[PDB]
Design a binder for this molecule. Structure first.
Ligand SMILES: *[C@H](O)[C@H](C[C@@H]1CCNC1=O)NC(=O)[C@@H]1C[C@@H](OC(C)(C)C)CN1C(=O)OCc1ccccc1
Ligand SMILES: *[C@H](O)[C@H](C[C@@H]1CCNC1=O)NC(=O)[C@@H]1C[C@@H](OC(C)(C)C)CN1C(=O)OCc1ccccc1
Lengths: 306, 306
């Protein structure tokens, strides 16, 4: 038993991380086969970063302008191109540690592990959720650009996120590995800001089931509610609408605990209207919304990866 | 910016993890050079596990009774011995992935990363603190024994914890890598229980500094307090006494924020006596005590590992 914010083992991604330097900008790259992927704003100077024509900026670059360091080994760049907001540096060496991988784009509400990196060296790993407003509440300092987010499915690394920038509220914005931003953000200097968020209702319900599995039952009740009546409360507390597909996804957890999904909705309704009255759930005094139903089943059952 | 519960990159430990089976018990082992380390209760049956003479149990074992699997490769055991509560299985092959390592025992209040494993396959990584009562609030299911906790210092893995068992409150108990239990727990069947815990005061102060660094200032004040007067409040709320060495350790964070340690103590005093009044700190409605001053400086500054 127990429930922790749990990241995937990071080894498979650690072996892909390299340092990319161009001009005076140093950031991280992801080295898979003979390509290094990194944010295209690496080609920018501090005055470039004010309304860039990236195509013009890139045609003025040379392969030798890109210093790529894999550990203490230099990688010769032999080609360069842009794909949307990422740069693809072709190197003369395929990464012998390339895991089986996929580039996947995730949905707001889904989680992934982030391997925070500086100077091509992994620093830490932690779990993030894609917020409904397409930001992530990460932990990133200067030099962290090019750090990736990912999930692992058996032996296959599904990369879903590349870090680009921090927004004024201290949250983070980036792209998928095709270079397409999550959300309405751009890699040019503007007053862009996160914009309004909501709470991920289905995840809170999953976490309430995690709590019950782990012995926290004080918020349970014999009350029930209808889906529509719950969704009226959800709206009032800035929670995402609950769909029948969410209810279906919560089936296995409902079955394991014997608490009907709509009963757990009634419990969430009371927690929203009443608060917790000085009590905690899984060591939290807040309703947690960054665990998916998958995450709860993963941890309250025990799957591994090879 | 941002602040997350952050584990160390797990790759160096992933390459050490193996599966140890003896009789009908399967658990994890740690393979370093030509030794596999694992909990000695692997030699126990469900009726052995009632008042064992482990020395008698072990003399009845043979090398071939121990099936050691490193991935899909079997490791021939060529010797076996006990060191306290761990077993040392000598194998005919040194682990080519052995990192530079040390066996260190940590202090209550210190943190470490746990690589949860099942069947020798890493499942997840997360950060834990050694509670003052020598338990850890982990996430462990059956088969997780032999999962290790560790810190990484530049390139060197300091192993500090091997998992053995879950206590009736759902918290976890284990040993250092010399096989010496953390706390008053034994690897035989008893009604042993955690016993009373306290809050790690110096860590809460570190986390309050993390909050200030990250822009959370609402709990600050111009009040100050004395060390003795703060420690009277600490006692009343079941917080650990704050020592002058704790104050000294908090110096760099105090200096970076410009908030005297004793001023932050005054703030903690008010938070203890008043609560938060519906506000949060670093996304928490509770005072968090599982980040050390080191952890805060690591994340609010950005160190890496090679
Ligand atoms: C790349 O390593 C870096 C990572 C951020 C620095 C602080 N936290 C981060 O996540 N990203 C940046 O520095 C990006 C590049 C610039 O963005 C464009 C103009 C769109 C190209 C500026 N920027 C950024 O994050 O600015 C906000 C910021 C906040 C805090 C500190 C520095 C910068
Ligand atoms: C080893 O993989 C296993 C891990 C625990 C199972 C559930 N959560 C865990 O952390 N450890 C055990 O099964 C240990 C071995 C036995 O302990 C001795 C008698 C001291 C040898 C029993 N045990 C244990 O953890 O019992 C409590 C328990 C709680 C919940 C589920 C199963 C067992």
């Amino acid at each position: 038993s127990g429930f922790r914010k749990m990241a995937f083992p990071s080894g498979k991604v650690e072996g892909c991380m390299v340092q990319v330097t161009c001009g005076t900008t140093t950031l991280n790259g992801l080295w898979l086969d003979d390509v290094v992927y990194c944010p295209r704003h690496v080609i920018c100077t501090s005055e470039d970063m004010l309304n860039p024509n990236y195509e013009d900026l890139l045609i003025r670059k040379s392969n030798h302008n890109f210093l790529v360091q894999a550990g203490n080994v230099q990688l010769r760049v032999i080609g360069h191109s842009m794909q949307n907001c990422v740069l693809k540096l072709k190197v003369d060496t395929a990464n012998p540690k390339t895991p089986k991988y996929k580039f996947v784009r995730i949905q707001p509400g889904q989680t992934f592990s982030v391997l925070a990196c500086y100077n091509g060296s992994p620093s830490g790993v932690y779990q993030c959720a894609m917020r409904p407003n397409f930001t992530i509440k990460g932990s990133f300092l200067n030099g962290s650009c090019g750090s990736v987010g990912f999930n692992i499915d058996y032996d296959c690394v599904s990369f879903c996120y590349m870090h680009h920038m921090e927004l004024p509220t201290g949250v983070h914005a980036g792209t998928d590995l095709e270079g397409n931003f999550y959300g309405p953000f751009v890699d040019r200097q503007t007053a862009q800001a996160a914009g309004t968020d909501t709470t991920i209702t289905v995840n809170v319900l999953a976490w309430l089931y995690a709590a019950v599995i782990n012995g926290d039952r004080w918020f349970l009740n014999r009350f029930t509610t209808t889906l529509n009546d719950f969704n009226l409360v959800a709206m009032k507390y800035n929670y995402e609408p609950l769909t029948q597909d969410h209810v279906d996804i919560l089936g296995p957890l409902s079955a394991q605990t014997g608490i009907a999904v709509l009963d757990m909705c009634a419990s969430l309704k009371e927690l929203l209207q009443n608060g917790m009255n000085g009590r905690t759930i899984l060591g939290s005094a807040l309703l947690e919304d960054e665990f998916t139903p998958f995450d709860v089943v993963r941890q309250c059952s025990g799957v591994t990866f090879q």
